[PDB]
Design an enzyme around this catalytic site. Structure first.
Site, PDB file in Angstrom:
ATOM      1  N   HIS A 139      -7.756   8.816  -1.026  1.00 21.57           N
ATOM      2  CA  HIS A 139      -8.240   7.898   0.317  1.00 21.57           C
ATOM      3  C   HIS A 139      -8.880   7.938   1.291  1.00 21.57           C
ATOM      4  CE1 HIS A 139      -5.909   4.757   2.327  1.00 21.57           C
ATOM      5  NE2 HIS A 139      -5.760   5.382   3.599  1.00 21.57           N
ATOM      6  N   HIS A 149      -5.814   2.422  -5.053  1.00 18.18           N
ATOM      7  CA  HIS A 149      -6.095   3.139  -3.546  1.00 18.18           C
ATOM      8  C   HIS A 149      -6.652   4.215  -3.597  1.00 18.18           C
ATOM      9  CE1 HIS A 149      -5.479   1.319   0.525  1.00 18.18           C
ATOM     10  NE2 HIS A 149      -4.402   2.227   0.599  1.00 18.18           N
ATOM     11  N   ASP A 193       0.949  -0.943   0.285  1.00 18.03           N
ATOM     12  CA  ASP A 193      -0.217  -0.116   0.045  1.00 18.03           C
ATOM     13  C   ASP A 193       0.553   1.213   0.190  1.00 18.03           C
ATOM     14  OD1 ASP A 193      -2.745  -1.367   0.102  1.00 18.03           O
ATOM     15  OD2 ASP A 193      -2.906  -0.911   2.131  1.00 18.03           O
ATOM     16  N   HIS A 205       3.956  -2.404   3.580  1.00 21.15           N
ATOM     17  CA  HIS A 205       4.548  -1.119   3.212  1.00 21.15           C
ATOM     18  C   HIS A 205       5.979  -0.972   3.573  1.00 21.15           C
ATOM     19  CE1 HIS A 205       0.606  -0.725   5.806  1.00 21.15           C
ATOM     20  NE2 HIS A 205       0.626  -0.355   4.931  1.00 21.15           N
TER      21      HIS A 205
END
EC number: 3.5.1.-
Length: 235
Positions: A105, A101, A50, A199
């Site tokens: 967000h 994504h 992500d 991440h």
């Protein structure tokens, strides 16, 4: 329709066995176009990331994936794409998949169909400006928050919603625990069909990943992409 907020979550994998989100989530997941596991019948792992902002380590993560000849799927936000076009271009040039994504967000369950469409399309628009290309449509909901409505609506827009089966705290900037913390989780939580969510912002995350891939391969795991996962199940 129903638009009841649901947080993606599950009891962590134990004994190297796939975790289970429960009969409730499992049903919803099947009903629409979504998954949290790949082929559990084989020793395969699918890496996903992500990416909301950059903290200096994504270039090394790309170097590591290239070294091991592994394909990652990077779920990016509008901010990330606008702030890091060169990294977006490397993801595309080096064989990876770029997932959505969403642009800002936001919590998608608080958005209208119209808004959702723009939130998703705007990311692809910017990625295309940069790469001249466009991957198959994959979406990861911000904060893992979704609802039956969000699933239905994003499926209608052509997206496959991708959750995960392995994740740990590697996103806290004020307490970056180092390589061992991350490496140990990647080894311990490993299981057939696992979809890892990582991440790239925490100290030594690339080095931990490099070591984890090396040792997971030694154990007999093969790393495949989210596109492989979709195509292989299709047969």
């Amino acid at each position: 329709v129903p638009n009841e907020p649901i947080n993606w979550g599950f009891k962590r994998s134990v004994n190297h066995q796939p975790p289970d989100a429960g009969k409730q989530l499992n049903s919803l997941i099947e009903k629409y176009d979504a998954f949290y596991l790949g082929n559990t019948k084989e020793k395969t792992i699918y890496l996903t990331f992500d990416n909301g902002y950059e903290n200096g380590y994504t270039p090394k993560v790309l170097d590591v994936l290239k070294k091991h000849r592994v394909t990652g799927t990077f779920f990016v936000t509008g901010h990330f794409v606008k702030d890091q076009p060169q990294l977006i271009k490397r993801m595309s040039d080096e064989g990876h998949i770029i997932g959505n994504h969403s642009f800002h967000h936001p919590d998608l369950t608080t958005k209208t169909a119209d808004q959702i469409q723009d939130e998703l399309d705007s990311v692809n628009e910017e990625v295309y400006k940069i790469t001249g290309k466009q991957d198959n449509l994959y979406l990861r909901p911000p904060r893992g928050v979704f609802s039956e409505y969000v699933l239905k609506e994003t499926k209608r827009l052509g997206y496959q919603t991708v959750f995960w089966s392995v994740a740990f705290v590697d996103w806290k900037i004020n307490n970056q625990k180092g390589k061992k913390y991350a490496y140990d989780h990647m080894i311990k939580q490993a299981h057939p069909g696992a979809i890892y969510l990582l991440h790239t912002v925490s100290r030594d995350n690339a080095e931990a990943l490099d070591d984890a891939i090396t040792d997971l391969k030694k154990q007999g795991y093969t790393f495949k992409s989210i596109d492989d996962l979709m195509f292989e199940k299709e047969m």
